[PDB]
Amino acid sequence: TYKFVNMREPSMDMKSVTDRAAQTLLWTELVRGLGMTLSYLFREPATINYPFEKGPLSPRFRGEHALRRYPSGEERCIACKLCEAVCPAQAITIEAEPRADGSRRTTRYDIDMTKCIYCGFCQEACPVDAIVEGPNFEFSTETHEELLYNKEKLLNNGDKWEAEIAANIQADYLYR
Amino acid sequence: SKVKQDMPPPGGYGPIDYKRNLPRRGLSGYSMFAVGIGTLLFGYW
Amino acid sequence: RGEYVVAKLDDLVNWARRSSLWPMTFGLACCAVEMMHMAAPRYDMDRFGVVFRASPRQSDVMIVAGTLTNKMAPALRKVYDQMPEPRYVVSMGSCANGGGYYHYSYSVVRGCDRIVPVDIYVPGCPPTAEALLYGILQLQRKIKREKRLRIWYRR
Amino acid sequence: MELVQVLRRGLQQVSGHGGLRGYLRVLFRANDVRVGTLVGEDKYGNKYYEDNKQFFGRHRWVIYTTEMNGRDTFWDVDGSMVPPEWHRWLHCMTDDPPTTKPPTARKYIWTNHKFNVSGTPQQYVPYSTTRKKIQEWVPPSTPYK
Amino acid sequence: MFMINILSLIIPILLAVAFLTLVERKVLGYMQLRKGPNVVGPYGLLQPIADALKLVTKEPLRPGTSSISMFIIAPILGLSLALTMWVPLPMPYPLINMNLGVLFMLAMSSLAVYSILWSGWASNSKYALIGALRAVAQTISYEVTLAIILLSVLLMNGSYTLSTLITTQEHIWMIFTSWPLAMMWFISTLAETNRAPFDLTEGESELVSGFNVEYAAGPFAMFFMAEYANIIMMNAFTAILFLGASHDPHTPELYTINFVLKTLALTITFLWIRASYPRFRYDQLMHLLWKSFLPLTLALCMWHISLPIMTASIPPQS
Amino acid sequence: LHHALIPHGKGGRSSVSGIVATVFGATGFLGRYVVNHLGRMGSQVIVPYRCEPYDTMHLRPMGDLGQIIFMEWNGKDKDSIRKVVEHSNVVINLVGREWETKNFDFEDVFVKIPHAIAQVSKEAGVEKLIHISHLNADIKSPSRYLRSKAVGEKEVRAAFPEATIIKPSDIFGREDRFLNYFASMRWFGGVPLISLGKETVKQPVYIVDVSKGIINAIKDPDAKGKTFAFVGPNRYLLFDLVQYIFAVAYRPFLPYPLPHFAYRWVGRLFEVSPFEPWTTRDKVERVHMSDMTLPHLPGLEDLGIQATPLELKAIEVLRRHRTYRWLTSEMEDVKPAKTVNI
Ligand SMILES: COC1=C(OC)C(=O)C(C/C=C(\C)CC/C=C(\C)CC/C=C(\C)CC/C=C(\C)CC/C=C(/C)CC/C=C(/C)CC/C=C(\C)CC/C=C(\C)CC/C=C(\C)CCC=C(C)C)=C(C)C1=O
Ligand SMILES: NC(=O)C1=CN([C@@H]2O[C@H](COP(=O)(O)OP(=O)(O)OC[C@H]3O[C@@H](n4cnc5c(N)ncnc54)[C@H](OP(=O)(O)O)[C@@H]3O)[C@@H](O)[C@H]2O)C=CC1
Ligand code: SF4
Ligand code: SF4
Ligand code: SF4
């Protein structure tokens, strides 16, 4: 099924041609164009009052990366390196070393925000829900080096946004 | 329990308009020319 | 006292600069689309005093939005040179920040900072238009904290 | 008729905001004069209003606190001044405000939501979080030779 | 106090030009479902002052290939003529009651193109020279019809003095007598002011910034001054010509209010059409006039030449 | 060497060089250029600054991310210098000012500030301090600039015995206030040489040569304690030098002899300005001193760097000053100004 978008021949009756000449001389579709914009000025604007008003999001939103931890206090990360092995941009660097207690934890877990693509592949690959993409997105920095995240900075993000991230995962883990 | 997922309502969604709805409005060409000429005549007088 | 007078002059000049930041139409890649969406009615750059303007001669802030490649870097540096001072560079997106997805490619500059001095680093791939608006407001506060005439007074 | 009511509620705009002084306060600070039910308030002072009659996007909003963490925010404010618990409710990611549904509490969660620490001397400086790899010979001290 | 009058015809005009930018960025933005400038103070009432401050403290670079002398004399020419052409307007009582006000304003409007000409040529750019030539063609084409339409309309006035128009439209607006020409005249006012949909001298989409491309900071703000003062003056002239208003000799404030309201409405229609159309393509805006505006306006010129004679309605010259 | 100061890489941006350094006064002329070279080889620079951070923006894009670090410092504050030089191998002193500001005279920026820098650097434990003076530095020169530079050299030598002292003659470059000065003198009628400028001999040295000399002196293990003199390859008569400057710029040349005291009055009148003082009494004086030849002092050639003649690198400086007429003429169009033999 196809339709001819522009295959309309105009009628050549005296009334039709008089109307076409009137539209040409007395600009008619031009007045319609004016009227449409008049109708929308009288309409309500769509602008929101940022930063006092924020655009809507979803619990699945991908933002600032963060390392979570168990309710006991121990970090969830076990240095299985799935996130490092699955990152499309190779933005994660992990070095592991058996801790004094014996549990295997990262001696270095750096995520480079200037190289990250915010795909969320790491948070899917993680088998313990250790690394997540937090809800934060207003974390712009004045210098480049501040975007090269360390293990300590990611742990601070996890401890800061934990209230939001726990609820976000709680409202989405069933879909996964 | 039963499976739950995003689904259309049991009776299906309502109709969705897609055809062009450019309305027709305004006087005829004869009437427009007549109004213009009458305004010109009144101004002339 | 002279310090108070130069302080007030600083506040006035900084307020003008921050309240009429005129950006440049230098969208490069997908990061430009969000650069358009904050110009879209929802976020509307215009209410914050920022109005898009080409012809670098009459613009202040450059939002490098998109991947900066080797073939384009001379053009970007030259165009940054055309901007009369004061000038600011906002880097949108991971590609313009440090390389992004194609950080290891053969024809991509590994960060816009290597070509121009970037003033605000906006992260994202692409950054949400809210995040870019936040970066612009951060630049606005930066201009607010300038101390030009104070330093001149303590030359 | 609707002209008179329209002129009238413009006076409820100034009446709701604590009189004329508060009216110009909110007009010069938050650039809006619209009123709304006080959904809540956080420990830092930000006031959190909602009005379901507004179209989706402006049904909820914030008047930021005047002071947070040793910083005057009467004139300069930003989106990072939202505590994590309320950032969910503000961004329409949930319909449960922290007042009604409070987020689960844990020891490691912070108690003072720091804003964007860029610029201030409380910035973040990247550094290697690992120890050394190759050690040195530390030559002995006895002259011997 | 003649100096007082001269200053009272300059500073208020400059302030009105400044707020024209704000009302444009608000009316346009509300056409496009946006809100326009809203942050600076209440309702953006400080944006004109803010960007005015920026443009006169931002660095005014001079291109290495420029011609210094004309590059500087062009903004002065533009602003000086834009401000000067406000003096013969019969706002209740014209400041300069000239016997040939219409011819004088035509002469200065024709001179105003030379600012664009010299600014474009002296800047030493491909885009600037392109915009200068587009300005050449546009203003010549539209100036022919400007002159003919002015003659046709003023044939019922009896002379070229601007004040007598008020006497001419004592009982009826002149637009009810020459509504066809008025349409054409309006279009000409759109094009001589180099505005939409004929703003091809700038051509932001295709010429980056046209003849302002190498103009930065103060000189750019000054060319914008000239452009917007010309916009308001053209709308004022159109209001004076066709949409006359009642003038009580004892209370000129009534005529001031009515005239100002009509100029405001005409300017608002200018921003209205600016935000409701695509942009013309060079030759079209020429082929629009040399093939559709010029013959119609010639015919209307003959019609208005004959009309007083056939009806014994020749207006007095004094 | 420390475990992180061992040289690594191939001299690129992201290569550990081991030249962790502090360059006081980096925000200007050679201070920029030196940093560039320090940024090019991959050395962590601890650039201090007192100006607005925006003016340091051009300092940002010459080092790999994390290398260049900016700090606030004040000349009359020992704590600031201690903070900036605490962890650094070398401390390069480039603080200077062609005029005397209200809060800083010549002695403050050429004796007091270098004294504080040298003393604090010695206390901290740095191994090299490259101090910069003028070649025509004399305790009896009429210009307070050179006299203050001489006493500052003596003080710096006393405080830091092994401090390398470099005495450049006259830096010419894209922003040099030496060739641009003569070029900009076209606005004030003609060029008013004192006694027609036929008695002053000037030896200008290229900016890149001086910056590379600083870098080599840092790398050279024998520059400690020595006092080098960085001069150009040729010695130009002042009138011939201005002839060449205006020929490369193709601007009309209008020489005009001018009595010394009248030029001092002109310098005072230009000193009145509460902004950048186009010309000072010190400035009009210095352009009239000849470059004192000091063959005993070691030169740039000892460091291994060949001085670039002014002719090759004069088109860069004066191409901006040319009008649209001679804006594209080649470098060989104007014949080298005759030079008095060394
Ligand atoms: C298909 O893929 C594509 C990509 O893929 C990667 C791309 O990347 C891109 C490229 C990307 C882009 C182009 C980015 C997207 C851009 C946009 C969507 C554009 C959005 C634009 C806007 C939101 C803004 C539009 C502007 C509007 C509506 C209006 C502008 C008008 C104005 C007037 C602005 C204000 C300016 C000025 C100069 C006015 C201010 C001046 C004054 C008030 C001066 C006043 C002075 C005074 C009062 C002086 C007074 C003096 C006095 C009284 C006395 C003086 C006398 C003395 C003696 C001193 C594209 C296109 C693409 O398609
Ligand atoms: N031809 C020449 O110019 C020659 C120069 N030299 C010496 O080289 C050095 C640098 O020269 P150049 O780069 O051309 O000079 P500039 O004037 O271009 O730069 C001088 C630098 O010193 C800083 N500075 C000056 N006074 C102070 C102060 N009181 N406190 C803190 N910082 C201060 C300036 O800061 P800011 O930018 O904020 O003002 C700037 O960084 C000077 O010692 C000069 O005498 C030696 C031989 C020849
Ligand atoms: S979300 Fe970020 S850190 Fe995780 S895999 Fe994607 S780019 Fe890497
Ligand atoms: S996938 Fe999760 S557990 Fe494995 S290394 Fe990454 S953060 Fe740690
Ligand atoms: S950072 Fe991401 S969104 Fe931006 S240009 Fe690069 S790949 Fe595209």
PDB file of C-alpha atoms in Angstrom, chain E residues 111-288:
ATOM      1  CA  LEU E 111      21.981  56.849   3.429  1.00  0.00           C
ATOM      2  CA  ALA E 112      21.701  54.224   6.181  1.00  0.00           C
ATOM      3  CA  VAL E 113      22.568  51.495   3.655  1.00  0.00           C
ATOM      4  CA  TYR E 114      26.024  53.040   3.327  1.00  0.00           C
ATOM      5  CA  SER E 115      26.837  52.023   6.897  1.00  0.00           C
ATOM      6  CA  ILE E 116      26.185  48.395   5.930  1.00  0.00           C
ATOM      7  CA  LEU E 117      28.128  48.932   2.705  1.00  0.00           C
ATOM      8  CA  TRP E 118      31.296  50.325   4.271  1.00  0.00           C
ATOM      9  CA  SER E 119      31.191  47.963   7.258  1.00  0.00           C
ATOM     10  CA  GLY E 120      30.894  44.956   4.957  1.00  0.00           C
ATOM     11  CA  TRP E 121      33.620  46.026   2.548  1.00  0.00           C
ATOM     12  CA  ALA E 122      36.123  47.255   5.149  1.00  0.00           C
ATOM     13  CA  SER E 123      35.942  44.031   7.180  1.00  0.00           C
ATOM     14  CA  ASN E 124      37.809  42.045   4.470  1.00  0.00           C
ATOM     15  CA  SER E 125      35.783  38.838   4.563  1.00  0.00           C
ATOM     16  CA  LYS E 126      34.005  36.618   2.064  1.00  0.00           C
ATOM     17  CA  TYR E 127      30.818  36.467   4.151  1.00  0.00           C
ATOM     18  CA  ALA E 128      30.878  40.213   4.826  1.00  0.00           C
ATOM     19  CA  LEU E 129      31.243  41.106   1.140  1.00  0.00           C
ATOM     20  CA  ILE E 130      28.475  38.643   0.252  1.00  0.00           C
ATOM     21  CA  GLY E 131      26.168  40.265   2.793  1.00  0.00           C
ATOM     22  CA  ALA E 132      27.077  43.735   1.546  1.00  0.00           C
ATOM     23  CA  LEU E 133      26.064  42.819  -2.008  1.00  0.00           C
ATOM     24  CA  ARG E 134      22.811  41.215  -0.842  1.00  0.00           C
ATOM     25  CA  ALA E 135      22.124  44.458   1.025  1.00  0.00           C
ATOM     26  CA  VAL E 136      22.847  46.419  -2.172  1.00  0.00           C
ATOM     27  CA  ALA E 137      20.278  44.473  -4.173  1.00  0.00           C
ATOM     28  CA  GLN E 138      17.651  44.303  -1.425  1.00  0.00           C
ATOM     29  CA  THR E 139      17.663  48.002  -0.583  1.00  0.00           C
ATOM     30  CA  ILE E 140      17.640  49.186  -4.203  1.00  0.00           C
ATOM     31  CA  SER E 141      14.726  46.918  -5.114  1.00  0.00           C
ATOM     32  CA  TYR E 142      12.706  47.903  -2.056  1.00  0.00           C
ATOM     33  CA  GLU E 143      13.657  51.603  -2.238  1.00  0.00           C
ATOM     34  CA  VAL E 144      11.990  51.959  -5.638  1.00  0.00           C
ATOM     35  CA  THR E 145       8.659  50.782  -4.215  1.00  0.00           C
ATOM     36  CA  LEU E 146       9.232  52.761  -1.011  1.00  0.00           C
ATOM     37  CA  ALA E 147       9.403  55.991  -3.011  1.00  0.00           C
ATOM     38  CA  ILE E 148       6.462  55.132  -5.274  1.00  0.00           C
ATOM     39  CA  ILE E 149       4.220  54.030  -2.384  1.00  0.00           C
ATOM     40  CA  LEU E 150       5.095  57.139  -0.379  1.00  0.00           C
ATOM     41  CA  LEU E 151       4.126  59.328  -3.337  1.00  0.00           C
ATOM     42  CA  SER E 152       0.875  57.418  -3.872  1.00  0.00           C
ATOM     43  CA  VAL E 153      -0.148  57.612  -0.214  1.00  0.00           C
ATOM     44  CA  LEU E 154       0.827  61.267   0.247  1.00  0.00           C
ATOM     45  CA  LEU E 155      -1.096  62.325  -2.868  1.00  0.00           C
ATOM     46  CA  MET E 156      -4.100  62.595  -0.525  1.00  0.00           C
ATOM     47  CA  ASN E 157      -2.046  64.499   2.070  1.00  0.00           C
ATOM     48  CA  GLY E 158      -1.425  67.508  -0.185  1.00  0.00           C
ATOM     49  CA  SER E 159       2.256  67.918   0.732  1.00  0.00           C
ATOM     50  CA  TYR E 160       5.230  66.120   2.301  1.00  0.00           C
ATOM     51  CA  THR E 161       4.992  67.655   5.774  1.00  0.00           C
ATOM     52  CA  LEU E 162       4.451  64.947   8.389  1.00  0.00           C
ATOM     53  CA  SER E 163       2.209  67.009  10.693  1.00  0.00           C
ATOM     54  CA  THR E 164      -0.569  67.465   8.106  1.00  0.00           C
ATOM     55  CA  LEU E 165      -1.062  63.693   8.043  1.00  0.00           C
ATOM     56  CA  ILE E 166      -2.771  64.160  11.418  1.00  0.00           C
ATOM     57  CA  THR E 167      -5.052  66.702   9.748  1.00  0.00           C
ATOM     58  CA  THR E 168      -5.519  64.337   6.798  1.00  0.00           C
ATOM     59  CA  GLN E 169      -6.695  61.437   8.984  1.00  0.00           C
ATOM     60  CA  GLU E 170      -9.002  63.610  11.078  1.00  0.00           C
ATOM     61  CA  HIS E 171     -12.128  61.503  10.496  1.00  0.00           C
ATOM     62  CA  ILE E 172     -10.846  58.196   9.070  1.00  0.00           C
ATOM     63  CA  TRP E 173      -7.661  56.150   9.081  1.00  0.00           C
ATOM     64  CA  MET E 174      -5.735  56.431   5.829  1.00  0.00           C
ATOM     65  CA  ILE E 175      -5.513  52.620   5.705  1.00  0.00           C
ATOM     66  CA  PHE E 176      -9.212  52.538   4.800  1.00  0.00           C
ATOM     67  CA  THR E 177      -8.309  54.595   1.704  1.00  0.00           C
ATOM     68  CA  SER E 178      -5.074  52.869   0.622  1.00  0.00           C
ATOM     69  CA  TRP E 179      -5.136  49.430   2.242  1.00  0.00           C
ATOM     70  CA  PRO E 180      -3.495  47.728  -0.803  1.00  0.00           C
ATOM     71  CA  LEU E 181      -0.488  50.073  -0.837  1.00  0.00           C
ATOM     72  CA  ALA E 182      -0.326  49.801   2.956  1.00  0.00           C
ATOM     73  CA  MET E 183       0.254  46.052   2.656  1.00  0.00           C
ATOM     74  CA  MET E 184       3.099  46.618   0.206  1.00  0.00           C
ATOM     75  CA  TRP E 185       4.369  49.481   2.356  1.00  0.00           C
ATOM     76  CA  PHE E 186       4.451  47.220   5.405  1.00  0.00           C
ATOM     77  CA  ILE E 187       6.475  44.636   3.489  1.00  0.00           C
ATOM     78  CA  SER E 188       8.878  47.372   2.411  1.00  0.00           C
ATOM     79  CA  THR E 189       9.282  48.457   6.036  1.00  0.00           C
ATOM     80  CA  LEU E 190      10.145  44.834   6.790  1.00  0.00           C
ATOM     81  CA  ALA E 191      12.834  44.796   4.109  1.00  0.00           C
ATOM     82  CA  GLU E 192      14.411  48.251   4.420  1.00  0.00           C
ATOM     83  CA  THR E 193      14.889  47.633   8.139  1.00  0.00           C
ATOM     84  CA  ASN E 194      16.559  44.423   6.920  1.00  0.00           C
ATOM     85  CA  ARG E 195      14.307  42.288   9.128  1.00  0.00           C
ATOM     86  CA  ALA E 196      12.514  38.992   8.594  1.00  0.00           C
ATOM     87  CA  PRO E 197      11.620  37.369   6.290  1.00  0.00           C
ATOM     88  CA  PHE E 198      14.066  39.510   4.280  1.00  0.00           C
ATOM     89  CA  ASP E 199      16.944  39.475   6.806  1.00  0.00           C
ATOM     90  CA  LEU E 200      19.298  38.048   4.195  1.00  0.00           C
ATOM     91  CA  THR E 201      22.032  40.627   4.835  1.00  0.00           C
ATOM     92  CA  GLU E 202      22.773  38.836   8.110  1.00  0.00           C
ATOM     93  CA  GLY E 203      21.536  35.399   7.037  1.00  0.00           C
ATOM     94  CA  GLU E 204      22.420  33.611  10.262  1.00  0.00           C
ATOM     95  CA  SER E 205      21.732  30.198   8.722  1.00  0.00           C
ATOM     96  CA  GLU E 206      23.801  30.702   5.553  1.00  0.00           C
ATOM     97  CA  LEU E 207      26.055  33.731   6.210  1.00  0.00           C
ATOM     98  CA  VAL E 208      26.896  33.035   9.880  1.00  0.00           C
ATOM     99  CA  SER E 209      26.365  36.696  10.782  1.00  0.00           C
ATOM    100  CA  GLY E 210      26.564  38.554   7.457  1.00  0.00           C
ATOM    101  CA  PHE E 211      28.034  42.041   7.743  1.00  0.00           C
ATOM    102  CA  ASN E 212      28.291  41.802  11.556  1.00  0.00           C
ATOM    103  CA  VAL E 213      30.525  38.731  11.366  1.00  0.00           C
ATOM    104  CA  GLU E 214      33.747  40.633  12.134  1.00  0.00           C
ATOM    105  CA  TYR E 215      31.970  43.209  14.322  1.00  0.00           C
ATOM    106  CA  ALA E 216      32.493  42.505  18.018  1.00  0.00           C
ATOM    107  CA  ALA E 217      31.560  44.150  21.328  1.00  0.00           C
ATOM    108  CA  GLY E 218      30.844  47.897  21.045  1.00  0.00           C
ATOM    109  CA  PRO E 219      30.614  48.348  17.266  1.00  0.00           C
ATOM    110  CA  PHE E 220      28.353  45.286  17.038  1.00  0.00           C
ATOM    111  CA  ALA E 221      26.115  46.622  19.814  1.00  0.00           C
ATOM    112  CA  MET E 222      26.065  49.923  17.925  1.00  0.00           C
ATOM    113  CA  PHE E 223      24.978  48.381  14.633  1.00  0.00           C
ATOM    114  CA  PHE E 224      22.269  46.622  16.641  1.00  0.00           C
ATOM    115  CA  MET E 225      21.316  50.041  18.040  1.00  0.00           C
ATOM    116  CA  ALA E 226      20.918  51.354  14.511  1.00  0.00           C
ATOM    117  CA  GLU E 227      18.886  48.336  13.405  1.00  0.00           C
ATOM    118  CA  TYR E 228      16.415  48.435  16.299  1.00  0.00           C
ATOM    119  CA  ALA E 229      16.045  52.219  16.295  1.00  0.00           C
ATOM    120  CA  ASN E 230      15.243  51.877  12.594  1.00  0.00           C
ATOM    121  CA  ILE E 231      12.681  49.163  13.397  1.00  0.00           C
ATOM    122  CA  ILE E 232      10.867  51.367  15.905  1.00  0.00           C
ATOM    123  CA  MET E 233      11.078  54.474  13.724  1.00  0.00           C
ATOM    124  CA  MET E 234       9.692  52.591  10.693  1.00  0.00           C
ATOM    125  CA  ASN E 235       6.797  51.269  12.734  1.00  0.00           C
ATOM    126  CA  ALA E 236       6.225  54.816  14.021  1.00  0.00           C
ATOM    127  CA  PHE E 237       6.233  56.168  10.461  1.00  0.00           C
ATOM    128  CA  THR E 238       3.755  53.497   9.369  1.00  0.00           C
ATOM    129  CA  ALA E 239       1.510  54.378  12.316  1.00  0.00           C
ATOM    130  CA  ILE E 240       1.743  58.083  11.447  1.00  0.00           C
ATOM    131  CA  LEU E 241       0.954  57.483   7.773  1.00  0.00           C
ATOM    132  CA  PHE E 242      -1.950  55.014   7.764  1.00  0.00           C
ATOM    133  CA  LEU E 243      -3.253  54.479  11.318  1.00  0.00           C
ATOM    134  CA  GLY E 244      -3.871  58.078  12.287  1.00  0.00           C
ATOM    135  CA  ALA E 245      -5.006  59.018  15.766  1.00  0.00           C
ATOM    136  CA  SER E 246      -7.089  61.738  17.377  1.00  0.00           C
ATOM    137  CA  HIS E 247      -5.144  64.831  18.447  1.00  0.00           C
ATOM    138  CA  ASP E 248      -6.620  67.257  20.959  1.00  0.00           C
ATOM    139  CA  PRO E 249      -4.658  70.526  20.602  1.00  0.00           C
ATOM    140  CA  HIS E 250      -5.038  71.177  24.347  1.00  0.00           C
ATOM    141  CA  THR E 251      -3.950  67.703  25.554  1.00  0.00           C
ATOM    142  CA  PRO E 252      -1.258  66.317  23.228  1.00  0.00           C
ATOM    143  CA  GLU E 253      -0.728  63.507  25.754  1.00  0.00           C
ATOM    144  CA  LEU E 254      -3.767  61.722  24.303  1.00  0.00           C
ATOM    145  CA  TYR E 255      -2.182  61.670  20.849  1.00  0.00           C
ATOM    146  CA  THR E 256       1.120  60.622  22.437  1.00  0.00           C
ATOM    147  CA  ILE E 257      -0.550  57.626  24.099  1.00  0.00           C
ATOM    148  CA  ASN E 258      -2.433  56.617  20.953  1.00  0.00           C
ATOM    149  CA  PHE E 259       0.622  56.994  18.702  1.00  0.00           C
ATOM    150  CA  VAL E 260       2.851  55.058  21.106  1.00  0.00           C
ATOM    151  CA  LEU E 261       0.282  52.262  21.333  1.00  0.00           C
ATOM    152  CA  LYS E 262       0.060  52.033  17.538  1.00  0.00           C
ATOM    153  CA  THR E 263       3.858  51.926  17.195  1.00  0.00           C
ATOM    154  CA  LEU E 264       3.974  49.211  19.854  1.00  0.00           C
ATOM    155  CA  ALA E 265       1.350  47.167  18.006  1.00  0.00           C
ATOM    156  CA  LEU E 266       3.186  47.524  14.689  1.00  0.00           C
ATOM    157  CA  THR E 267       6.486  46.489  16.278  1.00  0.00           C
ATOM    158  CA  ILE E 268       4.773  43.515  17.934  1.00  0.00           C
ATOM    159  CA  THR E 269       3.532  42.489  14.491  1.00  0.00           C
ATOM    160  CA  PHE E 270       7.142  42.777  13.304  1.00  0.00           C
ATOM    161  CA  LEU E 271       8.282  40.268  15.935  1.00  0.00           C
ATOM    162  CA  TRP E 272       5.152  38.229  15.162  1.00  0.00           C
ATOM    163  CA  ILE E 273       6.051  37.777  11.501  1.00  0.00           C
ATOM    164  CA  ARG E 274       9.707  37.244  12.435  1.00  0.00           C
ATOM    165  CA  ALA E 275       8.696  34.098  14.354  1.00  0.00           C
ATOM    166  CA  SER E 276       6.187  32.692  11.858  1.00  0.00           C
ATOM    167  CA  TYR E 277       7.924  32.327   8.490  1.00  0.00           C
ATOM    168  CA  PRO E 278      10.840  30.736   6.681  1.00  0.00           C
ATOM    169  CA  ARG E 279      13.418  33.074   5.130  1.00  0.00           C
ATOM    170  CA  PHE E 280      13.399  34.367   1.561  1.00  0.00           C
ATOM    171  CA  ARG E 281      16.083  33.364  -0.946  1.00  0.00           C
ATOM    172  CA  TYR E 282      17.865  36.457  -2.339  1.00  0.00           C
ATOM    173  CA  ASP E 283      16.558  36.641  -5.913  1.00  0.00           C
ATOM    174  CA  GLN E 284      13.047  35.698  -4.780  1.00  0.00           C
ATOM    175  CA  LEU E 285      12.747  38.820  -2.639  1.00  0.00           C
ATOM    176  CA  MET E 286      13.897  40.670  -5.753  1.00  0.00           C
ATOM    177  CA  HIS E 287      11.613  38.707  -8.080  1.00  0.00           C
ATOM    178  CA  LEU E 288       8.830  39.334  -5.567  1.00  0.00           C
TER     179      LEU E 288
END
